[PDB]
Amino acid sequence: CKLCRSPEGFGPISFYGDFTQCFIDGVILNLSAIFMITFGIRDLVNLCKKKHSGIKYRRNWIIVSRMALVLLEIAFVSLASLNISKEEAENFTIVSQYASTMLSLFVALALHWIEYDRSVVANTVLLFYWLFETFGNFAKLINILIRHTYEGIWYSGQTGFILTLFQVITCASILLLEALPKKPLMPTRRKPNPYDSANIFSRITFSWMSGLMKTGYEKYLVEADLYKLPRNFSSEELSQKLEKNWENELKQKSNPSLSWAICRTFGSKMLLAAFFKAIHDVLAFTQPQLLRILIKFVTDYNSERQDPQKLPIVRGFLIAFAMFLVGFTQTSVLHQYFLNVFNTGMYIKSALTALIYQKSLVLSNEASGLSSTGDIVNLMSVDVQKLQDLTQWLNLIWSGPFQIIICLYSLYKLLGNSMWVGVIILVIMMPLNSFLMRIQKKLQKSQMKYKDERTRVISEILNNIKSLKLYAWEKPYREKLEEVRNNKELKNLTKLGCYMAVTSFQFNIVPFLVSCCTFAVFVYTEDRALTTDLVFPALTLFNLLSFPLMIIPMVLNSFIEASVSIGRLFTFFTNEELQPDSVQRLPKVKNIGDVAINIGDDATFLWQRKPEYKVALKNINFQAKKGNLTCIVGKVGSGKTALLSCMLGDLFRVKGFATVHGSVAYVSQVPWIMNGTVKENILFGHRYDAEFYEKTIKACALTIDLAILMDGDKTLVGEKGISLSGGQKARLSLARAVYARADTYLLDDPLAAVDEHVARHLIEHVLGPNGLLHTKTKVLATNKVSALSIADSIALLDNGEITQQGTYDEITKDADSPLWKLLREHREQGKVKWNIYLEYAKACNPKSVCVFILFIVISMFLSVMGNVWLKHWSEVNSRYGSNPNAARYLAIYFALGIGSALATLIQTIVLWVFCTIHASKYLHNLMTNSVLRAPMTFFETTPIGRILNRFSNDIYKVDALLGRTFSQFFVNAVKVTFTITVICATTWQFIFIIIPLSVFYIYYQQYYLRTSRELRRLDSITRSPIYSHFQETLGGLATVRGYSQQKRFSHINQCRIDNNMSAFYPSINANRWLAYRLELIGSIIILGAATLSVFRLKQGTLTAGMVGLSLSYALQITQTLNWIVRMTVEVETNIVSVERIKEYADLKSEAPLIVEGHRPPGDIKFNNYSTRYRPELDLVLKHINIHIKPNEKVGIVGRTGAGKSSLTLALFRMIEASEGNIVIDNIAINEIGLYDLRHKLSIIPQDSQVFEGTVRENIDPINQYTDEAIWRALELSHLKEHVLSMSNDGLDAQLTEGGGNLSVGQRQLLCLARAMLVPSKILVLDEATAAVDVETDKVVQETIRTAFKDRTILTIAHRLNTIMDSDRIIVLDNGKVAEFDSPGQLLSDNKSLFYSLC
């Protein structure tokens, strides 16, 4: 039996809404006290036990004030015990309460002192103890006050009431004085994370993000602003933990399993997250039950009040407050669950992204080559990502069914057996919905495929725009591009939009249709009346049920993907190691020459065992002296690289002992270059020491290349090393080696890939005995006699066997065949660019967008009227005892629901067809109309990479994602507008709540809009360097172990991961901070709506339907608010795409293609002509006045830096005249249409180009030249046999794009074919210093005559050999000019500058 004495037993909830006095005293204030006893003593001992004396804080007013309040509340509890004894204190609960509370207060008395001395964070246990004291004592105050105001009598007397009021005041004051104060300590690198100092309420409410959010709002963020990771997130510690557990799995268990390794390491946090998810589920499904209880209460009370122990109107207020407490606790526990799952996600990425790299540095060479570099890079750019994203969804494998089981139970409970119709409809939809997910994916991948197609077309067009513009091929390739786009890509996009509208229709109908069918079957099978307390809680429960059944299949999909990824990682970590004993290693030897620096005792070295045991380097005796050069010789691929690798350890020793002394340096067969500064590729982590740095760089004979380089050694080796070339690279690698001053040098053809002059330079400064490195051993593999002359010892190997070994004299005496032969924006946060939104609304038809919004409004209006009709129907069914006109009411409800569904279908169709696709088409046509139409200055100044990004990455987003982002934003904005409208209509004085909440909501969504955008950008920036670093390390994996620098490289990877987590942890915690603020705003809206509804009830003018409807709507604000804020962040992140498109679309352009001065279908004369290659540059041509007659085969010469190259651009107006002009046979170019000029003239480019597809379009794409003429041109250039052999199609033969499918001279002949094919009255020629084969070169030099016997020829050429045949010569001098007859006449006058070379 209950061991208490009170009319209101332990029953937690009294007849009135609030807790029974026995529950408050017996359970709440007793458990708080017992919690405080246990955990408070635990913390007391812990703080005393953890450290004998910690860095103390100033005992400022704070500590003394909270101390005083503890004493005050102790006084009040003592006074309560004194006061209540007489008033039947035999009721055990009161005495238990005061005993426990007195003991608890003493323990807190102590613990505040101890925490203030010993702990930085305001202790968790005191914050929660005082939260429960304030809560319990507030419950007691409310209980007393309710009993007073209802039953007329104070159950603890006037004194007990006021004393409890003081207890509540003291508890609240002490709780705030605990949580709020910052704590005085009375005592560059990024400041410590606030998550370490945040007390438990700050951890719950993520208010420790408020400082970062303020900074992100006030200014742009950079890695100087992001706080360091909190303690335990360092990739090194995470990787060590996971690696210890993984090693335990590998060695202590017979069947190791990486999945259990990860569980053993990071399972505790996921289990806690699962607990919080369970509590969240329970709360999410109690809240609809409180809605049902509130509606049932309202109808009971209203019926009684119209027309003993009548219900109290305080139960309505307590139920509204219960709704608020459930909302608040739900959001707190939910975001703790999210915090823990994402912390485990970042752990698993950091722990694995580092452990993969540490494994990579240990992989055997065989295995590393077996795996593709791209594969292994994916192994942590995708596979580890899957594991990270698996954690987010891991807990739904049980919270999925768990959130379904209790939802089905609740629906059965309240709505009866008919529920099964709704469950059946959702289940039936699940296959269909998943099938549409597959179809959406298929169409989206097709869209990405066509995006890649268009990206390739744009890539060629932009890359060789110079030529394309030069021939005037702008319009034909524009037509090609727009054909591809319009037909293949946008038709696919309309298909995607149609099925997107279908999926939106399903998404909107199914939650409606479930409820409609369930109410139908309920009405037509159940004898009960469909009361308004059954309709609305059922509707909320179906809305909740939507999500688990929506998500579970996607969870299983992510689960199978994660399982495959764990499989890949497991096969990786088990991948074969290099054996650490392949070569034993010893320190350096102090002496010189005498000692063997490295040894091989008849040892054998297999490349691998298990993939293939058969191949090995044979049993070799080998030696190398200290302070000498030992050289290795032999044919290519015979084992030189293997021998060197052996002392590098990449080969697998099986027999004989091998040893090497001291630190080593390695130069690979191909010199590895790591992206970064050239100075960095020299230093390679070794400290900068000038007097040796410049000596070394000189010795490596590339100071000339530093002089050529724009920024010298400070120049950045381009992404993936594209900036340098092999000649520089070999020298640079050897420079790294020498600068290391390694105790040994293993050199695999360090000097073979460069000219003999450079080789001799390196020999005489580095390798020769006089060289700066004489005291350091060299084991140099090569065959060049110059190098061999330095060798103190040599060995020749064939097929993995050293044929002979000895010094140079012995090699000489051997008389062997080879032996004899050998011997962006400022960081002030400027407001959003509304003008770009207007531009987009103009790209979408500005009336189509309004039709879109109109149909969104109709959809949501018809959903609201669906619920209002449901309210009317339920009020009728409650007025009557049974369902009076099921057919009528249900049919109208179905009509309204299908009205909403059709409104949404029209919404999405109008969006995708009229609005978004129209804008995409318009913007792309505008952008291509501008870019291709832009002058050559644009392309010279701007990176082709970025210009191509605008077309591939950027306009794709405006195509596909911006439209849906706007649609989600407006759907949810209208949804919330109508939800607020419904709640206000139910309680007009809700406006005074929504306005303050609206201000707070704008405040938070704005802070988040700026800071989450910045942190997402900054995470994106910091992400890639991890993968790029990994791929370069894979490429250079040999050298890294070479120098024995795996330590530094591993540490660089760790600090490449920690940077990412510094960028990420704030991002996801930003999501948490926003979501907490918005879910608490939602909880306050629930409280406002429910309490104002109860007030209207007390006024007696509330009907249960109104409260049911208003709250059934207010419950889903909690999610629609957060979803609006996510969509507004996303739309700001995308609309910058339209900004980037517009910035190109309006580019200033060259003169019009066409103008009245047409060429009706020839000789030329310059007239004081001048121009500059760049508008800010000085004139490259000045006062040019040359006259050329119609047939003269003119050539031109000039200084290397002269405008000789720039002339051709100047003639075709690619660079516009500064003053003067060029006149043609009868007309001046400055008023000729550019297309007319450009194509009536003819040209062969400075360098040729290749387009994808057939040669027909590379000779005549516009097809204005007849097939017979094309065939004749192929004859004249005799490419004909070549194209016919390439494919039977001959002149229409297919051609591969971008590859080395053709040697230069044949491309030049194809260009000449274009030239002779076009009927032209001028023909300009060009040629540039390049690796042209002399054969095809002379073929060109003779066929150029055959092209036009009579046409004027402006032969630009760097090859005077090409120029000498010219009949007239122009000499250009940095804008100055001289003109002459043929070169013989020119040189007959003076010893010309060029004649000096000739």
Curated annotation (Swiss-Prot):
<feature type="transmembrane region" description="Helical; Name=5">
    <location>
        <begin position="161"/>
        <end position="181"/>
    </location>
</feature>
<dbReference type="Pfam" id="PF24357">
    <property type="entry name" value="TMD0_ABC"/>
</dbReference>
<feature type="topological domain" description="Cytoplasmic">
    <location>
        <begin position="338"/>
        <end position="393"/>
    </location>
</feature>
<feature type="topological domain" description="Cytoplasmic">
    <location>
        <begin position="1125"/>
        <end position="1398"/>
    </location>
</feature>
<dbReference type="GO" id="GO:0000324">
    <property type="term" value="C:fungal-type vacuole"/>
</dbReference>
<feature type="transmembrane region" description="Helical; Name=13">
    <location>
        <begin position="900"/>
        <end position="921"/>
    </location>
</feature>
<feature type="transmembrane region" description="Helical; Name=10">
    <location>
        <begin position="502"/>
        <end position="522"/>
    </location>
</feature>
<feature type="transmembrane region" description="Helical; Name=7">
    <location>
        <begin position="317"/>
        <end position="337"/>
    </location>
</feature>
<keyword id="KW-0677">Repeat</keyword>
<dbReference type="InterPro" id="IPR050173">
    <property type="entry name" value="ABC_transporter_C-like"/>
</dbReference>
<feature type="topological domain" description="Vacuolar">
    <location>
        <begin position="143"/>
        <end position="160"/>
    </location>
</feature>
<feature type="transmembrane region" description="Helical; Name=3">
    <location>
        <begin position="91"/>
        <end position="111"/>
    </location>
</feature>
<feature type="topological domain" description="Vacuolar">
    <location>
        <begin position="1100"/>
        <end position="1103"/>
    </location>
</feature>
<feature type="topological domain" description="Vacuolar">
    <location>
        <begin position="86"/>
        <end position="90"/>
    </location>
</feature>
<dbReference type="GO" id="GO:0046686">
    <property type="term" value="P:response to cadmium ion"/>
</dbReference>
<feature type="topological domain" description="Vacuolar">
    <location>
        <begin position="523"/>
        <end position="543"/>
    </location>
</feature>
<feature type="topological domain" description="Cytoplasmic">
    <location>
        <begin position="565"/>
        <end position="841"/>
    </location>
</feature>
<dbReference type="GO" id="GO:0042144">
    <property type="term" value="P:vacuole fusion, non-autophagic"/>
</dbReference>
<feature type="topological domain" description="Vacuolar">
    <location>
        <begin position="415"/>
        <end position="417"/>
    </location>
</feature>
<feature type="transmembrane region" description="Helical; Name=2">
    <location>
        <begin position="65"/>
        <end position="85"/>
    </location>
</feature>
<feature type="topological domain" description="Cytoplasmic">
    <location>
        <begin position="45"/>
        <end position="64"/>
    </location>
</feature>
<dbReference type="InterPro" id="IPR027417">
    <property type="entry name" value="P-loop_NTPase"/>
</dbReference>
<keyword id="KW-0547">Nucleotide-binding</keyword>
<dbReference type="GO" id="GO:0015723">
    <property type="term" value="P:bilirubin transport"/>
</dbReference>
<feature type="domain" description="ABC transmembrane type-1 1">
    <location>
        <begin position="270"/>
        <end position="561"/>
    </location>
</feature>
<dbReference type="GO" id="GO:0055085">
    <property type="term" value="P:transmembrane transport"/>
</dbReference>
<feature type="transmembrane region" description="Helical; Name=17">
    <location>
        <begin position="1104"/>
        <end position="1124"/>
    </location>
</feature>
<dbReference type="GO" id="GO:0008551">
    <property type="term" value="F:P-type cadmium transporter activity"/>
</dbReference>
<keyword id="KW-0067">ATP-binding</keyword>
<feature type="topological domain" description="Vacuolar">
    <location>
        <begin position="1"/>
        <end position="23"/>
    </location>
</feature>
<feature type="transmembrane region" description="Helical; Name=4">
    <location>
        <begin position="122"/>
        <end position="142"/>
    </location>
</feature>
<feature type="binding site">
    <location>
        <begin position="634"/>
        <end position="641"/>
    </location>
    <ligand>
        <name>ATP 1</name>
    </ligand>
</feature>
<feature type="topological domain" description="Cytoplasmic">
    <location>
        <begin position="112"/>
        <end position="121"/>
    </location>
</feature>
<feature type="topological domain" description="Cytoplasmic">
    <location>
        <begin position="439"/>
        <end position="501"/>
    </location>
</feature>
<feature type="transmembrane region" description="Helical; Name=16">
    <location>
        <begin position="1079"/>
        <end position="1099"/>
    </location>
</feature>
<feature type="transmembrane region" description="Helical; Name=12">
    <location>
        <begin position="842"/>
        <end position="862"/>
    </location>
</feature>
<feature type="topological domain" description="Cytoplasmic">
    <location>
        <begin position="1008"/>
        <end position="1078"/>
    </location>
</feature>
<dbReference type="InterPro" id="IPR017871">
    <property type="entry name" value="ABC_transporter-like_CS"/>
</dbReference>
<keyword id="KW-0105">Cadmium resistance</keyword>
<dbReference type="InterPro" id="IPR056227">
    <property type="entry name" value="TMD0_ABC"/>
</dbReference>
<feature type="topological domain" description="Cytoplasmic">
    <location>
        <begin position="182"/>
        <end position="261"/>
    </location>
</feature>
<dbReference type="InterPro" id="IPR003439">
    <property type="entry name" value="ABC_transporter-like_ATP-bd"/>
</dbReference>
